[PDB]
Amino acid sequence: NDLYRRVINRNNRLKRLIDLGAPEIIVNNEKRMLQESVDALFDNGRRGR
Amino acid sequence: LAAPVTHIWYFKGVPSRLGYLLDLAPKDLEKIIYFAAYVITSVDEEMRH
Amino acid sequence: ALRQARKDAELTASADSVRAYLKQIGKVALLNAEEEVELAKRIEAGLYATQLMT
Amino acid sequence: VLRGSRLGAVSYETDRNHDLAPRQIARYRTDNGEEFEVPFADDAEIPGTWLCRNGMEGTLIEGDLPEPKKVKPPRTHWDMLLERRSIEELEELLKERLELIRSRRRG
Amino acid sequence: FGFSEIMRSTLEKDNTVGTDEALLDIYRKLRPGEPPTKESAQTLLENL
């Protein structure tokens, strides 16, 4: 539930930033965070801490 | 998802199956999918020539 | 030299997400009060301009 | 000894198949053309819109209801600007910026 | 280390002369990705 909640939290915030029209530094940081949260859901500790 | 995400099983674990299919080194693939470098998806040869 | 040692450290892996973000945001100068006033005036002018245009 | 309950009930009934209440089937359609069937009870009021299996609302397929209206955001950047400026002040700012770009490009 | 042919050989084969150059060579791999500033490179060993 914690891993699924991280995926949902970062996905909803990315939707907010895209419809807010934020700069690409913020949007790319959000996308990289979403990618790392889905990776930690599937296989935790395989890539990184 | 509001942005596409790669599966960790097909990117990371040796041998990198995504790297073998697309012919990219794993170090050059990590930089793309974790937002540290750009990749040229397409080029135009008639207009350039 | 120290130039080349700066640039070779400038393009690296940085496989930690916090460190990558901090390196990315530490590449723009700060602002002073009259510059902030100029930017705010430009924002308001452009916003009224697009409302007027639509 | 630890003893926990996932907070639900288990009933002891015989699952029959014959004497069941009547049902009617509605059909909905989302904004990308998908279609879904929902079994409502026969003595029940069919709603106009339904949240389907894509997670997007679909309108009822029978052309009866003029229901959805505007629920507009009262908070945009233009609204936040307008509550602290005036039209003449913004017009003066716009004309000053226009004169600066005329003096820059044209002069 | 005047008694050691090991130390004389590894002094000759290092191809790096100068304290500032050596501090640069250490700093380039100790904290990779950070630009080498002079005071930070000079105090990295002491504060480590």
Curated annotation (Swiss-Prot), chain D:
Judging by the UniProt lineage, the source's domain of life is Bacteria
Q: Which GO terms describe its biological process?
A: positive regulation of DNA-templated transcription
Q: Which GO terms describe its molecular function?
A: bacterial-type RNA polymerase core enzyme binding
Return the InterPro entries for the record: RbpA_sf, RNApol-bd_RbpA
Give me the segments passing through the membrane: none
Pfam families named in the record: RbpA (PF13397)
Q: Which UniProt keywords apply?
A: Transcription, Transcription regulation
Q: Does the keyword Transcription regulation apply?
A: yes
HAMAP family in alphabetical order? RbpA
Q: Which family does it belong to?
A: Belongs to the RNA polymerase-binding protein RbpA family.
What the protein does comes down to:
Binds to RNA polymerase (RNAP), stimulating transcription from principal, but not alternative sigma factor promoters.
- Subunit structure, briefly? Forms a complex with the RNAP catalytic core and with free principal sigma factors.
Q: What is this protein's record name?
A: RNA polymerase-binding protein RbpA
Q: Which organism was this protein described from?
A: Mycobacterium tuberculosis (strain CDC 1551 / Oshkosh)
Q: List the top taxonomic levels of the source.
A: Bacteria, Bacillati, Actinomycetota, Actinomycetes, Mycobacteriales
Please name the gene that encodes this protein: rbpA
UniProtKB/Swiss-Prot annotation, chain E:
Report the domain of life of the source organism: Bacteria
Homology family: Belongs to the RNA polymerase beta chain family.
State its role.
DNA-dependent RNA polymerase catalyzes the transcription of DNA into RNA using the four ribonucleoside triphosphates as substrates.
Assembly and oligomerization: The RNAP catalytic core consists of 2 alpha, 1 beta, 1 beta' and 1 omega subunit. When a sigma factor is associated with the core the holoenzyme is formed, which can initiate transcription.
Q: What is this protein called?
A: DNA-directed RNA polymerase subunit beta
Record the organism: Mycobacterium tuberculosis (strain ATCC 25177 / H37Ra)
